[PDB]
Amino acid sequence: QIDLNFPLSEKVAIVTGGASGIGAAISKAFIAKGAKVAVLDISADIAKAKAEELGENAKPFVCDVSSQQSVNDAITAVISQFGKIDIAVNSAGVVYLAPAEDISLDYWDKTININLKGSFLVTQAVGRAMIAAGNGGKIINLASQAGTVAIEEHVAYCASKFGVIGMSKTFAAEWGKYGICVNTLSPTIVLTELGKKAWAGEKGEAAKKRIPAGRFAYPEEIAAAAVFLASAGADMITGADLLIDGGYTIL
Amino acid sequence: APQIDLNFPLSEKVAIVTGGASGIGAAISKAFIAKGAKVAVLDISADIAKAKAEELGENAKPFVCDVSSQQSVNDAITAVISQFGKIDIAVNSAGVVYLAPAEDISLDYWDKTININLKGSFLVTQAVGRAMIAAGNGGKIINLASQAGTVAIEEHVAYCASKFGVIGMSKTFAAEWGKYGICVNTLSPTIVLTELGKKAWAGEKGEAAKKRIPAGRFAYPEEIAAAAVFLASAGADMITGADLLIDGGYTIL
């Protein structure tokens, strides 16, 4: 029987980048749905503050997603604390923009190492855990509208996000046999505290003109999609890229 | 419309081809020479590049390039411009394949794949595009992707990540550089019967793979090269950001 309230009661979720922005909203949503949440972030202080805020079912873990050791140690620590991992969300991304003829190798490598390699390392470590446990699982990787369309100044970002989608689809293909659904979530511009700042004024008004919905997405809306994809209502959804873009990419 | 020559000549255009001394790069270099182009054969060693450029005759010249090194790539482009005066066409065909089950695949296989297939394509496309923008005469950039840039394939988690990435990257260069007359496209083959590929699919391995391809066979390097000639020509000036599958229909099912 599929419970159409989409409960997550007693499931254990990892959320990378979980202490701010989209990741904070996902952590909060998962807590509200009865899950245990491992809040993973590169800053121990930021993770500590977020997990304390979210209450007794949220615990902090330091994790540099670009580091295989840091990732493996975090996964081990989450298992030691909670017993198992049912859900993992990868929402540690970075954005480094410049015209394509100018963009530095540093901007390129940081983008690829964090957005693409980081998603690889976290997905592989969590998936190994899930395979060993034998109870299936859910992996949700944040991609972007930029995993579907080109955007000016986003050569590295688009490369990383298109890559995340191909990568995630391959994990989905190979891990169906283990009951692990692997999907991507692809937002348009999101009104995180940062995004509010970066898309204020006429710049934001101009961007909204091209979105059929006529506004940007809230982090809470991205988290609602994560809740659905993490649930028992989505067991036949795998390899999917769910766009939350207000129509941006369809024109 | 201009007179568009439906023989698709590349007379006096200068083309760089990475991985130009073997497999698909070698076939592309040979095709471009046959169409009248000057070809800069880039490969990882001086001897290998020299042997191909000698094979291809007086309009082909050799250059050493490790596409995963910014310095190597920049030096190669500078040397090509010194030798030929300009770059009109660049093809990135130096890719690598490292396969393993997704839960097992090493960070070494991941890095080698991303660094050559994706970062290498970025470095070459950026260096070539800079030269093209500066010269003001437009240009053509053709990046080899793969059927694996559209579909997942078991054991190909790093390969698919790199090839999806190449397409996204290439489409962004296309969007930004249309204003400078530079078309940037990808070519996405199924399995190709390079000297290597022949050895690699020699088995029932090959016969089973073919059952899933509507065309019922693999592609030859010369077929990939024919598509490259078309995309490098004046018959393709309105084609940019496109991914042209040469997959015998593999990906449509």
TrEMBL record, chain B:
The keyword Oxidoreductase applies. It holds the Pfam family adh_short_C2. Coiled coil: none annotated. GO terms for molecular function: oxidoreductase activity, acting on the CH-OH group of donors, NAD or NADP as acceptor. InterPro entries: NAD(P)-bd_dom_sf, Sc_DH/Rdtase_CS, SDR_fam. The keyword Hydrolase does not apply. Keywords: Oxidoreductase. Belongs to the short-chain dehydrogenases/reductases (SDR) family. This is Sorbitol dehydrogenase. It comes from Brucella suis (strain ATCC 23445 / NCTC 10510). The lineage of its organism: Bacteria, Pseudomonadati, Pseudomonadota, Alphaproteobacteria, Hyphomicrobiales. The gene is polS.
